[PDB]
Design an enzyme around this catalytic site. Structure first.
Site, mmCIF file in Angstrom:
data_model
loop_
_atom_site.group_PDB
_atom_site.id
_atom_site.type_symbol
_atom_site.label_atom_id
_atom_site.label_comp_id
_atom_site.label_asym_id
_atom_site.label_seq_id
_atom_site.Cartn_x
_atom_site.Cartn_y
_atom_site.Cartn_z
ATOM 1 N N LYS A 56 113.531 57.892 108.985
ATOM 2 C CA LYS A 56 112.800 57.226 110.073
ATOM 3 C C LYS A 56 113.230 57.805 111.420
ATOM 4 O O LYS A 56 114.285 58.436 111.518
ATOM 5 C CB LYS A 56 113.062 55.712 110.045
ATOM 6 C CG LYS A 56 112.267 54.970 108.979
ATOM 7 C CD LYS A 56 112.739 53.532 108.858
ATOM 8 C CE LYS A 56 112.201 52.875 107.603
ATOM 9 N NZ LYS A 56 110.759 52.542 107.739
ATOM 10 N N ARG A 108 107.616 49.801 97.573
ATOM 11 C CA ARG A 108 106.616 49.597 96.556
ATOM 12 C C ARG A 108 107.139 50.056 95.188
ATOM 13 O O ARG A 108 106.695 49.542 94.155
ATOM 14 C CB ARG A 108 105.317 50.326 96.946
ATOM 15 C CG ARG A 108 105.465 51.856 97.090
ATOM 16 C CD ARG A 108 104.279 52.446 97.872
ATOM 17 N NE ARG A 108 104.391 52.172 99.302
ATOM 18 C CZ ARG A 108 103.593 52.694 100.232
ATOM 19 N NH1 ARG A 108 102.622 53.507 99.873
ATOM 20 N NH2 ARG A 108 103.769 52.402 101.513
HETATM 21 NA NA NA Z 1 109.951 51.864 103.810
#
Ligand code: NA
Ligand code: NA
Ligand code: NA
Ligand code: NA
Ligand code: NA
Ligand code: NA
Ligand code: NA
Ligand code: NA
Ligand code: NA
Ligand code: NA
Ligand code: NA
Ligand code: NA
Lengths: 489, 489, 489, 489
Positions: free
Chosen positions: D263, D337
């Site tokens: 990130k 997920r």
């Molecule tokens: Na993520």
């Protein structure tokens, strides 16, 4: 390469010699081509008439070759602006740094014509250009350098000091230039301890898990993901009954990857240089203690590598600092100020220092405040601000002031769940370099009851690919009144 | 909305009234709930005991409601850091700006308890919160505002001045807040000319092709691609035999798209505010001339819109400035400094000004030097630097110093084919805000032979979505010694 | 290329023919290789046994060649998810669009085996693949296309309608595919007026400075910097005493550069397609009025080019809309919603419409809400939401719902100095596509007292390099109950 | 701080008390200033006349101070849009969250006037504002909070439930607010197990290498590079012969660095909050089981830290999931997920659940679909979609629907060498939040044969710097019919 500063022009050894003559234009105009100077310069300059003819022709400032490869005259400008140093010492660096010496040169002889207030900065500027560090596997030459200062007021003791200052400057730069795979945290601890031994200092080393146990949360948590462990090193020069108690706290980040908030592809080269504050403070301490420093003085080096692993600091982490206060880390690339917060708190609470300087390569924002030649100083003490600006001009290690306003700016570091954040990632009311300083200061009440000065040297610590060795000259001139050195009084 | 400042608490008109009481904590502690104050406050505060009880409870600073909708106490902090103003006037703005008045409020009564050195900044801070400009098509209310100052030393003449200052501040902000499709170059010329008429000034207006013919290359070429033409406006207040000759040069870029080097999607909103320097200088001139200004004074407004068309400035273009010097434009988003270069040269050469101020919203870099509350001042005159910093503290229009070093930094603007570039697009040695200032100064020898001060107010000219009206308060306190106003002496 | 839809398999003209057979797997399984079908297919398929053998082998769905170049079978899946159309019409497009016909093909014969609820979407999907627009200077072929539908319930009148629908679809796509240097604002006005003439409509055209004078601030100020002038076009089909009064408002931005907040290098190609809402509404109106539309119906086309000049809208500009409300433009790339605000207000206040649809290619954000196949519908009327979703499934022009919550989301467009901003450039509480819709709705009280539906078709209006012709099929099925067409009842 | 909900206004303890009165405008208008209410309010509100006068003056909604620091009235709007909750509970949070209590406050007394359908959401909204988590080292105050609900239909049993719900909400938020250096995977396992013990649940913990051996490839490979090991925690409330078998699967990513696809600097703060789904499901399960939950219910918590090391997942890696299917990881920042795919498969295959909810903070894309207040729900069951939307309105934990179309959208996850990719890094046909949900669903046949609902709560799980505690209120109202609580029936 060895560098010796001498009081007066003297002969240099046998061996191919390179001659560089340095002076302000007005000084050079009054130099007589006679005596020892003639003896040295006559190899390159024909006679007194040809000397004076050349000095007439040459502009206000510059560099002029006196031979096809062995000699140069550097003219330093006389005029200077009020924001500059009237020594114009940076002009010497600018003209001298590009100079190369033929492969078979044995000696470099400098003849420096300088008035007394210029000598220290001029000598330092010359010293900076003899870069110790290289890992080239061919072409390495060691030179014998003599900087012969021509100045009436200069003493032999001043020349000893100037030789020591030249070494401190070149040592700062060497430590900066060394890649971090060589200058690890362990290696920088070892370098500090060597200075500790040579100075007869009381030495404290708090390392790895010992930092955590002793509550150095800033130093420990920043450095815990390094390939070698974090460390806090104190060298103490204790003078019973001294009126001053001075701490020099230095940021010794041997490499900063940025941490988990990682630096960019183009922003991560040069981050070996993030220990420039530690190196500068260490070598300043060395130069001062070598010359009968009459007050209590401490070097406090916070030494970490900021790297990336599952155990590293993450943005959102909250840690407890040496001060007992909590800090929410929202920026792992703002880690230097965390280790300094512990260093400055230690200096106050354990060392009982009443004058606390911290010096660090912190923010890229510093260059937007004070440019690339001036360190940015933020202090609770107006008189000290003026004194360090004056010291910057006298030393050539230039210093410009930062606003001091914790009331206006400390709100930029507000946290909902800790005592403060370490940084602000958006728009803030303060100059970012000031806000970085205030993080550190928040852990000692912004200097309340004492004198605290924070000095950001991110840009002036380097020019191009080389460390400048910023720090020793500044602190020599700032604190030189406590030494035995005539020129520092 | 009308704003009147009165010397002492008086009754306000009939009609629903909102009461706001303002004071430093130590001042409020010594207020007796009696007399005219009791008469005003007893609507909301029960008696003297309940007053004193509340004053005891309330913290060092803040805002406290005295009613469910019509009344507030604002407590101003007593303490301040050295980098802030000791008036702490920004605290008033911070607490007051969020306040809304019920739809049917007719009057807003302020009781300001302030010592004499605080009055001007406190009144200005209150004035700033009555934003003139709105194009909302419902809900518009005009209020009658009375700022009743309780201060022993305050005179009736001081209250006239403070009313005029409040107007100058609110006018500066109104001009800033007005969108550029309304405040075009023509509209801003008209606004300036209106002040010119009211002040009995000698008015000069050089516009459109007249600028080109007269050699104003900066003003002309920057503004030539605007939907309405560029203009230079001079208002002159000439005092025969005055010892000072002062020019206030203002950047009046009614909109900056960035030009062909266009601003980004998120960077172009707010660029109506790029005429804040012009607005501030115009309204400062108005306030001073209203009060018997004893020296020669000029407002010089450089008024352009920087927009995009096939005839606009392109990076690489070289133009000739009013000074006769050439500038290579490498950055069309650095256009404000070009128009100011002509303004300052005109002030020197045509107006014979010996004190030249230029004030402008220039760089985003300014916030990285001096933060968001302090203007950044760069001057060739150290005494003037100290004086304007002092004026910033006295006025609440804060000012911090920039390094002045043309010798070190002007090289950032080196050009191979013109006398200079207007900007440096990479790494530079100076702080970028200083370098922007030096472009302007290069056209008058960096102030040589006179006093020149450049003031970058990019960030302090605005808070959130609103102009602050920065400028009039600063120059009133700086130059107020030349007026008839007791509080300015 | 001409496209005719026929009720039943018939012979096609002389000339080289390409045969494409289309059906759901379960339908094709029950087809007997006999009669007219045998006659058509036996060129490529040997006999009934080889037919049945092939149908057994082929998977649930796909495309299968029946010849080396002239023939294909497209199998449409029987199964579908609840979010998709049970027609699975997009599968036809997916398999058919890549098909090329040999250079010398004269005819393309489609035999479509479809149950009655599938016929309209399947025919539309085939029509979409006959792209009218090309400026290639070789290889252009005009084909005679016969779509022969095999469906018991289908009438001859249905086939007329389906031919008109195929034209409306291909026309929408043609207008979309045409570059904006050809389809200027003038050209799109002319196209609209041609439909106006053919439909016997009452035609209103407000153009250029007439828009400003009549107070259409959105349409005028958005389009004023176009190379050809802005226009508002109304085609009215007025039915005395009708119970419904329906307006179809379309966004007809013939090109969007983004305006002064200019689009990026890669973001500006495809912006000829920003008039897809206008084209879709125009061609829907045409198809409905051709078939005895029993209610009052209006097409309202807002036609502008959004381009860049010194007179263009700038972020910060405040304009007054047709509604009388003011809008602060902070985003010139959010201009489509401005012109639609005037269109919808006109529909309410001047046309007295009580059902108002606006359809537009607005935001890239729409794809993040409803994906690339579904239009995103925001409406004040729950029943209408369900009805248009049902119409989307029946037509193959898929529609998904957006949250309707002006109370929660309209605050995203708060302005301090105008009634609203046109966009929010940071973080907002609403889905951005919903917030864009709410800008439009704010000018008619979010539909209060009537039915208002906003439909964002940015992504479903195109696949790859080609317009899909989205709109006519949706509105034919939605409003078809007011026509004479059996299949629409 | 303790929070108790009581049925009716009662006295609170001795000690400085803060009073906050809350009600919809229409409800407050009918409140008589008499009895227990008068007794509580008379300290701040003079009499019945002054009460009614104030209620007349105050607008449709807002917050009004009743004292300088100790009291407030919050007016909740009566009107609401169809996409909002008619409770308008978010208005309470908006007005209450900014409120601070004086340092020496002991009690906060809330008098909530609410009709029965509003009580639960209003109480939850108040509870959310008492943030448990802080590591500030000064200023920490524990308060005694009494929320006194005035509602005729409310029972004493309802008040017990509301106290438990307030705790569940505050606990969810506490877990979210806790930094990940404290709430490690081990710490969150411990928190879950504590709830397990208190609920008398059957507890399963599968940790570290045990996950790999048991075939949990998603949970294991995602979490293997954490500083503490990955874990799957099941709490089971088994009711022999129950007709329903319900699993609540929660995403418990204690920190997400993004993994090797790391990130950004500004995108990584707040990623402690990526376990909000796990926290919400855990605390929902706790509140339901405390109240005689009559069906089989499981909480399934997938608990990992996603961090960076040479053993971490790399894009291109292919892993085998619990389902036996293979997933090509092209995006390590799409890891949540993956762990949920194992959780949902376990719930189906091992637990035999026939109703499977998964709740997670997944994508930033969710806010572009449903905004910041609504969770985005994707389900194979239309009736369940309507039921959860209804539950969202009743609870104040708002829910908006996502398209369910695996046939149209699952192709976005096509892989050439594995059964699917985990993400699509370019243009996709589905809304990205839907596509993320479909990755999970692909491992249980998209819910075939049962009811599956995926709920993305990325944005509604937080406001500003604080967790909202989203989840417990939603599931209480959705599944409350299976409890003994009168207000949930
Ligand atoms: Na993520
Ligand atoms: Na060599
Ligand atoms: Na750093
Ligand atoms: Na660092
Ligand atoms: Na109103
Ligand atoms: Na500019
Ligand atoms: Na500008
Ligand atoms: Na051809
Ligand atoms: Na647009
Ligand atoms: Na557009
Ligand atoms: Na405290
Ligand atoms: Na995650």
């Amino acid at each position: 390469t060895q560098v010796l500063v001498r009081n007066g022009i003297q002969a240099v050894g046998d061996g191919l010699t390179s001659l560089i003559i340095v002076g302000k234009k007005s000084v050079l105009k009054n130099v007589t081509f006679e005596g020892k100077f003639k003896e040295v310069a006559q190899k390159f300059v024909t006679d007194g008439d040809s000397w004076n003819s050349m000095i007439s022709r040459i502009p206000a400032s510059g560099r002029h070759p006196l031979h096809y490869e062995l000699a140069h005259l550097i003219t330093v400008p006389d005029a200077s602006s009020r924001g500059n140093t009237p020594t114009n010492a940076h002009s010497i660096y600018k003209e001298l740094k590009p100079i190369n010496y033929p492969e078979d040169t044995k000696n470099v002889h400098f003849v420096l014509f300088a008035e007394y207030p210029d000598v220290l900065s001029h000598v330092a500027a010359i010293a900076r250009t003899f870069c110790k560090f290289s890992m080239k596997t061919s072409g390495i030459r060691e030179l014998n350098v003599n900087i012969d200062v021509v100045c009436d007021k200069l003493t032999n003791e001043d020349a000893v000091f100037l030789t020591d200052l030249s070494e401190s400057v070149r040592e700062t730069a060497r430590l900066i230039d060394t890649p971090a795979n060589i200058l690890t945290t362990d290696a920088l601890v070892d370098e500090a301890v060597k200075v500790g031994n040579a100075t007869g200092s009381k030495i404290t080393v708090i390392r790895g898990e010992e930092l955590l146990k002793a509550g150095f949360g800033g130093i420990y948590h920043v450095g815990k993901a390094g390939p070698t462990p974090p460390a806090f090193v104190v060298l103490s020069h204790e003078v019973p009954g001294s009126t001053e108690h001075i701490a020099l706290v230095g940021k010794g980040v041997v490499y900063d990857t940025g941490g988990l908030q990682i630096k960019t592809k183009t922003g991560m080269p040069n981050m070996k240089r993030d220990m420039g504050g530690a190196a500068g403070m260490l070598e300043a301490y060395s130069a001062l203690v070598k010359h009968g420093f009459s007050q209590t003085l401490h070097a406090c080096l916070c030494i970490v590598e900021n790297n990336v692993s599952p155990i590293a600091n993450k943005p959102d982490d909250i840690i407890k600092m040496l001060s007992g206060k909590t800090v929410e880390i929202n920026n792992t690339d703002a880690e230097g100020r965390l280790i300094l917060a512990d260093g400055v708190f230690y200096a106050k609470e354990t060392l009982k220092a009443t004058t606390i300087f911290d010096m660090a390569t912190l923010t890229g924002a510093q260059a937007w405040l004070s440019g690339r030649l001036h360190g940015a100083a933020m202090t609770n003490d107006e008189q000290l601000e003026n004194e360090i600006i004056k010291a910057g001009k006298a030393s050539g290690d230039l210093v410009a002031p930062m606003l001091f306003a914790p009331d206006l700016f400390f709100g930029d570091l507000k946290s909902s769940i800790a005592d403060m954040k370490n940084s602000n990632l958006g728009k803030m009311d303060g100059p970012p370099s000031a806000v970085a300083g205030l993080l550190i200061g928040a852990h000692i009440g912004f200097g309340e009851g004492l004198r605290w000065l924070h000095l950001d040297i991110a840009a002036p610590a380097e020019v191009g690919d080389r460390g400048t060795g910023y720090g020793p000259a500044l602190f020599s001139t700032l604190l030189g009144k406590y030494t035995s050195v005539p020129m520092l009084k």
